Amino acid sequence: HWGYGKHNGPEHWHKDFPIAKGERQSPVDIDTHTAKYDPSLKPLSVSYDQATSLRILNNGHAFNVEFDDSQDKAVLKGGPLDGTYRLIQFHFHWGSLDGQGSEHTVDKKKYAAELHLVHWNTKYGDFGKAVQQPDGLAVLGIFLKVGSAKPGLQKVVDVLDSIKTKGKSADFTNFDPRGLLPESLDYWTYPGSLTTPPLLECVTWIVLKEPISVSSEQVLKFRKLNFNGEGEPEELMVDNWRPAQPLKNRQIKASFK
Ligand SMILES: CSC1=S=Nn2c1nc1ccc(S(N)(=O)=O)cc12
Numbered sequence: 272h273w274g275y276g277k278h279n280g281p282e283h284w285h286k287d288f289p290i291a292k293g294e295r296q297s298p299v300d301i302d303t304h305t306a307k308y309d310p311s312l313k314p315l316s317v318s319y320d321q322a323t324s325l326r327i328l329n330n331g332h333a334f335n336v337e338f339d340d341s342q343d344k345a346v347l348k349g350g351p352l353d354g355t356y357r358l359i360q361f362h363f364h365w366g367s368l369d370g371q372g373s374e375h376t377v378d379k380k381k382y383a384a385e386l387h388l389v390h391w392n393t394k395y396g397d398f399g400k401a402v403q404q405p406d407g408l409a410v411l412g413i414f415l416k417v418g419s420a421k422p423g424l425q426k427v428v429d430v431l432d433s434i435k436t437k438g439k440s441a442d443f444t445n446f447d448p449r450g451l452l453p454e455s456l457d458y459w460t461y462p463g464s465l466t467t468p469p470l471l472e473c474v475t476w477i478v479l480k481e482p483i484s485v486s487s488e489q490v491l492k493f494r495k496l497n498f499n500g501e502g503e504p505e506e507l508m509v510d511n512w513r514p515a516q517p518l519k520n521r522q523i524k525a526s527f528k
Pocket residue numbers: 359360387389398410464465466467468469
């Protein structure tokens with residue numbers, strides 16, 4: 272029932288998922304000036320060399336590129352993390368216009384889109400168990416601005432016409448997620464939640480300071496996807512972002528400056 276419309280959008284989610292008004296919800300606005308520099312934060316360790324993408328799926332909320340997470344093939348560690356976290360999938364949130372689409376904001380600035388690379392703590396054995404733990408997930412968030420094309424994104428964009436509507440999936444092998452990363456791994460970090468139902472408060476957020484640039488044609492292809500199923504009338508998959516939630520009793524930490 273939940274989605275991103277006038278009658279089922281983020282402002283309605285609390286009725287089915289009361290944790291929507293919880294103490295550690297995501298996303299948030301990142302106030303760059305009040306973020307606390309922590310010189311004891313380690314560099315982020317991204318080990319994606321052995322990544323195995325499997326499939327791409329339109330789930331009716333976004334599209335997800337799924338990975339083989341049955342071994343330590345693509346892992347996140349270091350940074351603010353004590354554990355090793357396995358890459359399970361990535362997806363994006365994006366807007367109807369280039370001026371909105373990101374979930375996190377930076378000094379109230381919205382980006383055109385936001386990439387989430389979702390990882391789960393291996394000490395919990397699977398994703399389903401990890402989401403029930405306050406240190407279960409690490410989501411690496413990367414902002415997208417519209418400018419030059421991201422060549423490493425083009426394989427994703429090109430396959431989207433095959434997964435136009437809710438429920439559709441396609442084989443998607445040999446995709447290298449390293450082609451989606453900016454030059455710098457400087458980051459902000461804070462404890463938060465899934466940004467869609469069930470909104471579980473299980474995520475260590477790591478948001479990269481440097482956005483990647485994608486072209487207008489690339490983001491236009493995102494906007495041609497459908498929220499609806501093949502049988503159903505067309506609602507374009509746009510503005511599938513949750514707005515910033517109250518920071519409450521949390522501090523955002525910075526690895527830099
Ligand atoms: C196997 S279901 C699954 S795998 N990764 N995720 C899932 N549900 C999610 C719901 C939300 C997010 S988010 N927007 O990265 O906080 C990631 C999710």
